[PDB]
Ligand binder design. Sequence first.
Ligand SMILES: CO[C@H]1O[C@H](C)[C@@H](NC(=O)[C@H](O)CCO)[C@H](O)[C@@H]1OC
Lengths: 216, 210
Amino acid sequence: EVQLEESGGGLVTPGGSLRLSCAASGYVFSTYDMSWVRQTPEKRLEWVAFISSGGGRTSYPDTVKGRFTISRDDAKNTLYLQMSSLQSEDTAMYYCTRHFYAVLDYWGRGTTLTVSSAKTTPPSVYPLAPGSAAQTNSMVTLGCLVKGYFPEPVTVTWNSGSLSSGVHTFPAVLQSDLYTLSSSVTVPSSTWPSETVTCNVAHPASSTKVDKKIVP
Amino acid sequence: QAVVTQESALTTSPGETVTLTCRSSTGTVTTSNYANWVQEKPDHLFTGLIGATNNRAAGVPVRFSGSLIGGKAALTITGAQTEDEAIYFCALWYSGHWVFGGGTKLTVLGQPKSSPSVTLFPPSSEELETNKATLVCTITDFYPGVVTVDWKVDGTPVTQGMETTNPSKQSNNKYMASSYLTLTARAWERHSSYSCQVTHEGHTVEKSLS
Ligand SMILES: CO[C@H]1O[C@H](C)[C@@H](NC(=O)[C@H](O)CCO)[C@H](O)[C@@H]1OC
């Protein structure tokens, strides 16, 4: 059972250095050529480095030439990516893959790298109330705008976990070096505003928690 | 170096045959480009399907095939199945360098088409106090997973200050997305009408606020 496992990513600041590891198992690691590839936040895949069986050839795209260095340790079944001069466009999930006779068949699970100078920052939480008695239906949708935090993630719950059907929490966007995301819930018209609906936002990197009550 | 381009999105139905293509800007794809096709499924799970133009990997269903067609590499799925809805990337080998395409979002109709449910929210009093105003347009329950969102302020199309998330898959396999219009609280007080328009499968759902 072929397995590739990357690790070593986390948060660094521009100008920093870091070594990612890709540990292989379940096949004879020394026979194959390998590559590292990253998937960016815009969701594109970019090839980043290549090393052949034996280590005699390595090759890189011009954007990381001179900064990244791939190498391999056959005795430990592990592929490395030495990164220096990191820049914020290096923020991505990094994956190792093997060249199985020119077929990129097995890919690892990937490790996240965020390169940013932002400081740890708790979010501000604002309520999203219909802002109209034009209530489409007998269902009313409400929300929480979770703005300006760093880094990810945040977890959103409603009424402390008691309200869980009809919740959509969207992927976060990057607005000016900080993240923003929204979560919404749709409830029956007779629930609100008779009953209370609060969004509970937890931000683990800053150990902060915010509870926002949504009022008409 | 080369620019690699693939169809952005395709829609097929289960049991049919779809073909996805990959072209180089360099001119013509060849056997010595060892075209590869990698599948991406939800939760960033990558699987190599085809490499060396037409060599299928082990365990990959037989309905996937690779070939070169009119100067391009191609992937055909004969008998597309429901679990095939996913993103497909191609990579071309340039004497030591891999160059990947943008990836095609392939939909395999596994449920009736479903129109987006759109909700447009006004900025709150508490964010106004900070001299900023965020308009949030939430779009859910749509299938297929591709939408287009346009904003208008007083009937004029907005060209900056907006950010839309990429469609993400819901529990029920329909998709959702968010869009944001970021203004200053002065700007919010100077305009009367705000509109969020969502275009899905030829139909436009619009939500406006005054
Ligand atoms: C000729 O170079 C290409 O085609 C070659 C066949 C590849 N060699 C290997 O894949 C393997 O690692 C061979 C096992 O030693 C190499 O990675 C590359 O793949 C696109």
